[PDB]
Design a protein around this ligand. Structure first.
Ligand SMILES: Nc1ncnc2c1ncn2[C@@H]1O[C@H](COP(=O)(O)OP(=O)(O)OP(=O)(O)O)[C@@H](O)[C@H]1O
Ligand SMILES: [Mg+2]
Lengths: 101, 54, 252, 906, 53, 385, 241
């Protein structure tokens, strides 16, 4: 109904290893979106599994957290925006990825 | 919001005028690297460069 | 390390269980003590949930340890019950042996001793409760207020604030109160306690509870009418105050 | 939305969103048939008004268009607006929105154009009734919320504006133009405007300034006075009223020619005079620069009150603040006439009290020296001037001077200037005269001359209240016929009194400045002082100077130096004015010579100032022309030419600086960029032109008050190290000086690198050294600014010697001038009746946030700092007073003005 | 930490700087230790018993 | 209307004017010279051949020759030719090479990399106080450390003590520590880098620590500068399990980051802003000081703070006629600044929806309950009562 | 963490064990006491069910402690068993000693003390039981309390503990009144229970009930656990069946 460019982007982002794994190419998403503005983004991190996962600060939790975190910095940005909007879909907010909200 | 909304519309027009300077400014340049007294060495350099021992 | 029992001393030389007990104090209700020169006023904040909780059958935060000693408390509500009971059986045991009204000084040392006992041994945690214990001595009219902490250190303080957001009450209290000239009349003493609790309650005079302990074993708990009467006078003078700065600034 | 008939009152509104029945059919038939229905229609008006009010909330374009479609036709088709006379006239209430629904809600290009014109005519006719005003008011203050009116209501107002503006652009005026169709004046629309103004001033801001500037008359502005002065405190505080008034005047600055712009600000001053704050008054009276207005605000406090009271103390403070001292002279002697106390009053107006306060500041700021140790040759000369440049303002460095060893090793022109630098150690000080006297009575005539200059500098801070005037010392020297002596004497008198055009000062200088037949280089100083004297207040454009400039030209042309200085003195003389200066351009131009053409472009800048954007395009056509003519062909003269070229360049810069200051603060950024494109254009095209424009640039910045100070001086400096004339560096450093130790940290390293590194001529080295020392005053002792300080739009007087000297290739003679550099700023302090020397607290904020004022009044939040701190330069200028919490009230609003704070404690 | 011992003297100096005083009292060093230590405690081991004692 | 017009007048005329003059002058640069500056241009164009490859200067060799490393696998032996002298070149500098016979043209790359463009900001924040709602003491501290030494060294002279080398910002989530950093960046008039701390981390052997090193390299040259590195809990010491690529990477980046920041004589005038959100994963060798020389705790607003944040935000929202500000802030307890920012946007939204052209009391109170749901803890009176 | 003993505290002065023991009570079935000024009704929901579970001859969350005070049970049944027996002994011990029955306020206080003791002392579990107390004693008339597993008590005019605590409490206070009636109170428990429970049948087999009244006879106090066939009868009248 909106008729804008979506940038779905399925359930993980570690599904791309053609340039290697997104560790700092997560940020590349925002650049490609900004050009093709409006930037309505959709993201699935459903997070129904793992009743404990919020106390972590992390082992190899850290890789996927570094991906999660860099999203937030880019979003809030510094400080120009082109009406960037992030729709999230998720199972609970009690069972959630630490510092996503 | 007409009384002040009018003046806002003019402000976006200003943004484009400053952008047009960025383009313009680049249109003529003058540059040079090295120093002026090393002009004689260029002359030499064409004879070595052209030549084959390197 | 080193907070996993009471029996580790730690190289920073703190017994953590005591340090963490202090942060539990915050959970309870503001309590304020102010001595005059013929009274001690002991007042506390009363939490109000809903209208389905009573305030009739539901316990006040001021508890009589006898008929001349009183106590208000801050900490876990569960903890405080046994602390008070044990203190009370001592207060009676004192007349059983001597036949004297309990000394204010003797009592506070007993309650700090109980917390100290718990704190020394590792088979228990201490009561996570600080109290203020007000009262008057068996026959002297010299007003006494003492404080205990979970550690089982007691002090005498002329005025002291404990409970939720204690520090912000402390600074106001420090300023206004004098040990050069404490309140001569119970009425100004009561209102100073009201002034202290005004800050932290915000709305309500049904969240301020006043009881007074005076010499000759008089303890009276004051009515909702009288407290509402005190808060309105404070509210009128405060309204007036705002106007005067506004005038004075224009005037100069 | 759908029709749902007359079941209830709710569905009646729904019924009429698609098709009215109480506004369309019935009414139409009645009007087009019976005329006893004229009576039914009158009662039904009320009903119809209500139905609009309910459906205002509906916004959709379609259900207002179509609904009221046939009513729109009816104006001319069936009613023809005169079938029953009075009755359509009063029935135009509802028909007027119908028209607006096609203008604005629906956009059909053909009708939206045409019906603008209709709307105007009917706005007028219906404003006789004064009911068109009420129609406007119900949308201006609102009843209902919809997007629609937020766009619509602007149009109604726009009709009025349309016509009134056009009467300036087209002369025919009135309703003869079919663009509006409505009479410009008359007692029918005039009453409409006054009433419209009232409602829009309360709720909005948009149209109140537009009406004034389109009438163009000072008369519109004087109606504004009446209404606003009622509003001054009961409707909203003093403060708010003030911010509007000056927003009107400061925003429309560029588009007001000279006579119009003085004439508008008169009225803003008076508005200020009526209202409670006289503090707002004094500041505008100064803007104008008229004598007449200064005196009314000073009088208003001194004369009524018999007693000393607050009233005398306040008058003195207020005049004391301008350090042009133009106000100082005028106000003095009233104090004498009243006679309560002579002693306190007279001293306090005088800049004598400003010395005392300086000692308090100095005490924090202490003494750190950093002077050159270098001795022998031209390096001796360099160091000895450098000592004064570091200890500018009241400093005590007595002992060093008393070591006459280094003093005496100066030679030539260096000797005069050496004594002259000494005078600036005791700049703004009573004491110091002593040092000067020793030399004045011994050795060559050279030391004697140099003594008089220094006297000039010392006397800057004590020359009123008839307490050692410079006039007293220096008269004796004028009489003495030796030229060096006499020239030096009048240079210092002019500096000291500054703007003060007192009878003794002025009149000593009046027969004189009138001998140029004898050929003497140093007689530049004949006119040069008098020009300086003149600035700071309205000019006569004195007949002494104008006659002598012409005479010199007749006599000589040999001394190129003499005539270049002369040309500038004339332009500096006309500063303080602009209206009267449009005349003298012609007068000068009557006599025509290519040598005279150099004088004109200079003067053009002062006449056009404050509306200039014609002036700008002109000073650029000039630049191009030498090259351009040559361009066409390709596909005694010496002196005249050189004057020609050089003048233009000075003029372009002066023009810019003065315009940007007064105009939009935004525009300050743009004008610097234009300069850089002017220089780039010159570096390639003319070799000779490039030399002049380098020097001009430093004073471009210092005058204009650029916001940026970090990037631009530094960057520019580097290119210009290669480029000849090291005098460049001195012109940059006067801008860079800033809040010492912010900008100037970068500066000492950057200026120092080129100097220290390169030594290939001691001549070259000398300019560089002086520039460096100037920049820094130790631990923020003082700041120099071209500006008044008291206004930030304002321009100084004392700083005009600095501005003069960047027009010529460097000269040892010029060095002597350069010592003089005056333009102090006082550090504010809270005063008391025992004259407390300490500030309590202040807020400072780098950047103002308020966008209602382009000046930006201080925020009330700020960042907090301590007692007795200098009033910071840029990135600290907004200053708010913190004292209110200790129950203290400023009497003297300070926004970061030069002025000293003053407080009343409860 | 010896490093944080260096930070005392710098911080003490900061208090003299905002006060506009041209020297550093005994008092303001007292504050300078207090800030560094009290901040550091936030990370590791909190609280004292000499908050009432 | 008059206030906007006054600013708009000055900034449009000059900027439009600066534009038009650049157009005329640009042509006019060229005509003066035609053989006086032209000569250097002709000689470069011929030697370069136009195509050119990069090399990195390995070392110099005494006899006006040099040896270079190409981006292709072989090295080549070059001769030093042309205008650019060998006192303008040292080892460790990039050089251009000629196509046909590889020859030292001169340098013009000046060790450029695409990561310098990323470091380099061009976007300018709002941002100054009076858009920062309270935290008076917190505003003050970051200004004295980061803004102040640069603007006024005078105080630092007089006392004679070195200026703060950094500051670290930490506290609760969403507190708006980010405004304050932005505010410092706008006001200074200094070269502002940054970067995100998640950008130094990759997976490729040894590239990560060299990206860390690069930031300082660009700052030290264009000093004084300020560097803002966000989120340092993306570059802490934390576990890394087993059978991971990233276990080395996290270790090396952090190590290089540490040495450069301390210096061995240091940059000496570049201050740093670190911000972070987890201090229980921070390494211990980055918050001990000489690195950072304040450490400051941010906490969620209280009554006075809330009223200020609120105060600025409501003045930028039309018609708060029947809206009392005080009555809302009183009831609100323990919220972030994020939550009050959100409540203004939500409350305006409810005012739109009401079919109302203005905000009300009831629009604000409804929005307020909603955002209290979001940030709530109740185990205080759960445990107690 | 600071789970590991029950005689520890945490950096925030919480104790994970007190919180965890508290959440145990929202795992077991709804229990509701509503005080009215004409009786107190106790109503409770079962947490077990099936066609071969016997629950039509038995109560297991309504215990008369003594003869004028009774409790509804919410929490673990094992935890519940011991403390119910202790509580009944002390209530009745008073009976012996003073030859008049225990007051409501003292008996709740006693049992809260015992609760608290398991957290305070030793290396034992806290007790995860929330008992709703409904009594009569002639000092304060009708008294409603509930005790937390933390081991403290507060008086009430209506309360709900056990599963869906938050939902039940909201439901009760919408339709409650201070005047009230005992008959309106029964109907109110039945009203709340329909919504709160995850079983849409909500028939007799799931429901316990006892009403304690002093309006039952005059000068006398009657605790009546209703029998299963009365519980059915009242479900028609409120119309749930
Ligand atoms: N004091 C304030 N004034 C104005 N807006 C505020 C204020 N505090 C919070 N905000 C608003 O709420 C936002 C919350 O801060 P933000 O989400 O950027 O987190 P942070 O804790 O600074 O993050 P990180 O650890 O990622 O650097 C701010 O950016 C601003 O939009
Ligand atoms: Mg942030």
């Amino acid at each position: 109904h909106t008729d804008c460019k979506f940038i779905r982007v399925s359930g993980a982002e570690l599904v791309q290893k053609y340039i290697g794994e997104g560790s700092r190419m997560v940020r590349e998403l925002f650049v490609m979106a900004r050009e093709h503005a409006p930037s309505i983004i959709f993201m699935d991190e459903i997070d129904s599994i793992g009743s404990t996962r919020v106390e972590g600060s992390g082992g190899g939790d850290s890789e996927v957290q570094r991906t999660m975190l860099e999203l937030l910095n880019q979003l809030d940005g510094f400080e120009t925006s082109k009406n960037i909007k992030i729709i999230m879909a998720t199972n609970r907010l009690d069972i959630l990825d630490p510092a996503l909200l | 919001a007409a009384p002040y909304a009018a003046k806002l519309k003019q402000t976006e027009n200003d943004l484009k005028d400053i952008e047009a300077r960025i383009k313009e400014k680049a249109g003529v340049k003058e540059s040079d690297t090295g120093l002026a007294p090393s002009h004689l060495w260029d002359i030499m350099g064409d004879r070595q460069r052209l030549g084959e021992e390197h | 390390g080193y907070d996993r029992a009471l029996s580790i001393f730690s190289p920073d030389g703190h017994i953590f269980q005591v340090e963490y007990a202090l942060e539990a104090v915050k959970r309870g209700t503001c309590a304020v003590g102010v001595k005059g020169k013929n009274c001690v006023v002991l007042g506390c904040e009363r939490r109000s949930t809903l209208k389905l909780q009573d305030t009739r059958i539901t316990p006040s935060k001021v508890s009589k340890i006898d008929s001349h000693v009183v106590l208000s408390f801050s900490g876990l509500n569960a903890d405080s019950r046994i602390l008070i009971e044990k203190a009370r059986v001592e207060a009676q045991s004192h007349r059983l042996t001597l036949e004297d009204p309990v000394t204010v000084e003797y009592l506070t040392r007993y309650v700090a001793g109980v917390q100290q006992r718990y704190t020394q041994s590792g088979g228990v945690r201490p009561f996570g409760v600080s109290t203020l214990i007000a009262g008057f001595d068996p026959r002297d009219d010299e007003p006494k207020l003492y404080q205990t902490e979970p550690s089982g250190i007691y002090s005498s303080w002329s005025a002291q604030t404990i409970g939720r957001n204690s520090k912000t009450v402390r600074e106001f209290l420090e300023k206004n109160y004098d040990r050069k000239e404490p309140p001569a009349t119970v009425e100004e003493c009561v209102k100073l306690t009201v002034r202290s609790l005004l800050e932290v309650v915000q709305t309500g005079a049904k969240n301020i509870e006043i009881t007074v302990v005076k010499p000759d074993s008089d303890i009276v708990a004051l009515s909702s009418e009288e407290i509402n009467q005190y808060v309105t006078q404070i509210e009128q003078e405060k309204q007036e105050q705002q106007e005067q700065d506004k005038k004075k600034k224009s005037n100069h | 939305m759908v029709d749902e008939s007359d079941k209830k009152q709710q569905t009646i509104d729904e019924q009429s969103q698609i098709s009215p029945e109480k506004q369309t059919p019935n009414k139409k038939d009645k009007k087009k048939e019976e005329e006893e229905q004229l009576s039914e229609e009158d009662a039904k008006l009320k009903t119809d008004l209500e139905l609009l009010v309910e459906r205002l909330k509906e916004d959709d374009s379609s259900l207002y268009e179509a609904s009221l479609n046939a009513l729109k036709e009816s104006i001319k088709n069936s009613t023809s607006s005169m079938t029953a006379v009075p009755k359509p006239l009063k029935f135009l209430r509802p028909t007027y929105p119908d028209l607006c629904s096609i203008y604005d809600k629906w956009t059909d290009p053909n009708l939206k154009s045409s019906l603008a014109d209709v709307l105007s005519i009917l706005a007028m006719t219906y404003s006789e009734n004064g009911k068109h005003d009420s129609l406007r008011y119900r949308l201006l203050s609102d009843v209902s919320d919809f997007e629609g009116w937020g766009h619509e209501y602007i149009r109604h107002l726009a009709l009025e504006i349309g016509e009134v503006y056009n009467d300036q652009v087209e002369k025919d005026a009135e309703d003869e133009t079919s663009s509006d169709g409505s009479k410009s004046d008359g007692s029918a629309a005039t009453s409409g405007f006054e009433f419209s103004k009232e409602d829009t001033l309360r709720l909005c801001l948009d149209i109140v300034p537009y009406f004034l500037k389109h009438n163009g008359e000072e008369d519109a502005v004087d109606l504004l006075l009446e209404i606003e002065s009622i509003d001054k405190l009961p409707q909203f505080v003093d403060e708010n009223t003030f911010q509007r008034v000056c927003q009107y005047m400061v925003a429309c600055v560029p588009l007001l020619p000279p006579p119009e712009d003085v004439a508008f600000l008169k009225t803003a001053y008076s508005i200020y005079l009526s209202q409670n704050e006289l503090t707002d008054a004094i500041a505008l009276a100064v803007r104008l620069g008229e004598e007449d207005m200064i005196r009314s605000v000073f009088d208003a406090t001194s004369d009524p009150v018999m007693h000393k009271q607050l009233a005398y103390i306040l008058a003195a403070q207020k005049t004391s603040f301008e350090y042009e001292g133009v106000q100082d002279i005028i106000g003095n002697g009233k104090l004498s006439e009243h006679f309560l106390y002579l002693a306190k009053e007279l001293n306090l107006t005088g800049p004598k009290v400003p010395e005392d306060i300086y000692k308090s500041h100095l005490d924090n700021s202490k003494s750190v020296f950093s002077s050159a140790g270098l001795d022998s040759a031209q390096q001796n000369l360099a160091s000895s001037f450098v000592n004064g440049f570091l200890n500018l303002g009241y400093c005590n460095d007595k002992l060093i001077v008393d070591n006459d060893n280094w003093v005496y090793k100066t030679k030539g022109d260096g000797m005069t200037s050496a004594v002259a630098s000494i005078g600036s150690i005791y700049q703004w000080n009573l004491d110091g005269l002593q040092q000067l006297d020793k030399y004045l009575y011994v050795d060559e005539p050279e030391v004697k001359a140099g003594a008089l200059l220094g006297i000039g500098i010392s006397a800057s801070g004590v020359h009123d209240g008839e307490v050692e005037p410079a006039l007293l010392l220096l008269q004796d020297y004028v009489t003495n016929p030796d030229t060096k002596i006499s020239s030096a004497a009048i240079l210092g008198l002019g500096i000291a009194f500054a703007g003060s055009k007192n009878d003794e000062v002025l009149g000593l200088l009046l027969p004189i400045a009138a001998s140029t037949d004898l050929p003497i280089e140093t007689a530049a100083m004949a006119s040069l002082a008098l020009a300086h004297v003149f600035v700071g207040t309205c000019n006569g454009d004195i007949t002494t100077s104008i006659m002598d400039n012409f005479l010199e030209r007749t006599a000589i042309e040999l001394k190129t130096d003499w005539v270049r200085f002369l040309a500038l003195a004339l332009g500096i003389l006309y500063m303080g004015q602009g209206e009267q200066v449009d005349d003298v351009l012609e007068t000068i131009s009557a006599i025509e010579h290519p040598m005279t053409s150099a004088i004109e472009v200079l003067v053009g800048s002062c006449a056009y100032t404050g509306t200039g954007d014609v002036l700008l395009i002109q000073d650029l056509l000039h630049r191009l022309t030498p090259k351009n003519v040559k361009g066409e062909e390709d596909a005694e003269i010496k002196s005249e030419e050189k004057k020609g070229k050089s003048s233009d360049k000075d003029a372009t810069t002066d023009g810019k600086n003065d315009d940007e200051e007064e105009e939009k603060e935004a525009g300050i950024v743009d004008e610097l960029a234009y300069a850089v494109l002017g220089i780039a254009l010159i570096a390639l095209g003319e070799d000779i032109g490039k030399e002049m424009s380098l020097r001009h640039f430093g004073h471009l910045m210092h005058y204009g008050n650029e916001h940026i100070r970090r990037m631009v001086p530094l960057a520019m400096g580097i290119v210009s190290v290669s480029d000849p004339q090291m005098k460049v560096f001195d012109t940059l450093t006067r801008f860079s000086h800033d809040a010492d130790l912010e900008v100037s940290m970068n500066s000492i390293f950057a200026m120092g690198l080129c100097g220290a590194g390169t030594n290939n001529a001691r001549l070259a080295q000398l300019l560089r050294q002086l520039a460096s020392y100037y920049s820094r005053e130790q631990d923020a002792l003082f700041i120099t600014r071209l500006a008044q300080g008291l206004l930030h739009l304002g321009k100084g007087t004392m700083t005009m010697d600095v501005f003069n000297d960047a027009h010529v290739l460097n000269k040892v003679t010029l060095a002597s001038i350069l010592t003089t550099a005056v333009g102090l700023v006082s550090p504010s302090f809270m005063l008391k009746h025992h004259q407390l020397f300490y500030m309590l607290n202040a807020g400072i904020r780098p950047k103002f946030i308020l966008a209602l004022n382009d000046e930006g009044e201080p925020i009330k939040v700020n960042v907090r700092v301590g007692q007795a701190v200098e009033t910071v330069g840029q990135a600290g200028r907004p200053k708010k007073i913190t004292g209110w919490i200790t129950q203290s009230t400023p009497v003297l609003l300070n926004h970061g003005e030069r002025a000293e704070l003053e407080t009343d404690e409860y | 930490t010896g490093a944080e011992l260096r930070s005392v003297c710098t911080e003490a100096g900061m208090f003299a700087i905002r006060a506009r005083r041209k020297v550093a009292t005994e008092k303001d060093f007292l504050k300078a230790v207090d800030k560094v230590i009290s901040g550091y405690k936030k990370f590791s081991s909190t609280s004292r018993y000499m908050q009432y004692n | 209307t008059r206030c906007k017009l006054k600013l708009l007048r000055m900034e449009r005329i000059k900027d439009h004017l600066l534009l038009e003059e650049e157009f005329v002058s640009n042509s006019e640069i060229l005509k003066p010279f035609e053989k006086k500056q032209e000569e250097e241009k002709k000689q470069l164009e011929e030697i370069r051949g136009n195509p050119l490859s990069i090399g990195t200067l390995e070392e110099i060799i005494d006899d006006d020759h040099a040896i270079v490393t190409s981006p292709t696998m072989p090295d080549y032996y070059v001769s030093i030719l042309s205008f650019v002298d060998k006192e303008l070149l040292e080892p460790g500098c990039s050089v251009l090479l000629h196509h046909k016979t590889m020859s030292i043209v001169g340098v013009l790359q000046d060790d450029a990399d695409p990561m310098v463009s990323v470091m380099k900001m061009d976007k300018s924040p709002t941002e100054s106080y009076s858009d920062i709602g309270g935290l008076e003491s917190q505003i003050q501290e970051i200004k004295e450390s980061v803004e102040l030494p640069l603007t006024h060294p005078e105080l630092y002279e007089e006392m004679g003590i070195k200026p703060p080398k950094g500051v670290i910002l930490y506290g609760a989530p969403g507190t708006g520590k980010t405004l304050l950093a932005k505010a410092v960046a706008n006001q200074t008039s200094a070269t502002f880098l940054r970067i995100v701390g998640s950008e130094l981390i990759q997976k490729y052997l040894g590239d990560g620590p060299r990206l860390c090193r690069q930031i300082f390299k660009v700052a030290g040259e264009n000093a004084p500068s300020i560097v803002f590195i966000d989120e340092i809990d993306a570059i802490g010491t934390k576990r890394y399990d087993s059978n991971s690529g990233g276990e080395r990477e996290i270790q090396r980046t952090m190590l290089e980051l540490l040495n450069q920041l301390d210096g061995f004589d240091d940059r000496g005038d570049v201050k740093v802003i670190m911000a972070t959100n987890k201090i229980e994963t921070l390494d211990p060798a980055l918050i001990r000081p000489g690195r950072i020389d304040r450490k400051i705790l941010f906490e969620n607003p209280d009554l006075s703070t809330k009223k200020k944040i609120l105060g600025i935000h409501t003045s930028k929202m039309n018609l708060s006629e029947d809206v009392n500000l005080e009555t809302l802030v009183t009831t609100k307890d323990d919220l972030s600044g994020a939550d009050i920012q959100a409540m203004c946007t939500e409350a305006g939204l409810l005012a739109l929806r009401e079919r109302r052209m203005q905000v009300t009391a009831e629009d604000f109170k409804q929005a307020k309950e909603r955002v209290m749901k979001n940030k709530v803890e109740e185990n205080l009176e759960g445990l107690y009562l | 963490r600071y789970d590991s003993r029950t005689t520890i505290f945490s950096p925030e002065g919480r104790l994970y064990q007190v919180e965890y023991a508290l959440e145990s009570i929202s795992h077991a079935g709804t229990a509701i006491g509503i005080m009215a000024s004409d009786g107190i009704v106790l109503a409770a929901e079962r947490k077990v069910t099936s066609t071969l579970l016997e629950q039509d001859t038995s109560t297991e969350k309504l215990y008369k402690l003594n003869d004028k005070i009774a409790v509804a049970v919410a929490g673990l049944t094992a935890d519940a068993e011991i403390l119910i027996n202790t509580a009944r002994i002390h209530a009745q011990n008073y009976l012996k000693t003073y030859n008049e029955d225990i007051p409501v306020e003292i008996l709740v206080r006693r049992l809260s003390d015992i609760k608290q003791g398991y957290t305070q002392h030793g290396g034992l579990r806290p007790f995860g039981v929330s008992f709703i107390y409904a009594g009569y004693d002639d000092r304060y008339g009708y008294q409603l309390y509930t005790s937390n597993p933390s081991g403290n008590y507060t008086g009430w005019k209506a309360i709900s503990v056990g599963a869906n605590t938050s939902a039940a409490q909201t439901l009760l206070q919408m339709d409650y009144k201070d005047d009230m009636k005992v008959d309106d109170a029964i109907e109110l428990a039945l009203k709340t229970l329909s919504k709160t429970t995850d079983s849409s049948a909500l028939t007799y087999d799931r429901l316990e009930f006892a009403t304690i009244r002093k309006g039952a006879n005059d000068g006398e106090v009657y605790q009546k656990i209703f029998k299963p066939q009365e519980i059915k009868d009242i479900l028609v009248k409120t119309g749930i069946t």
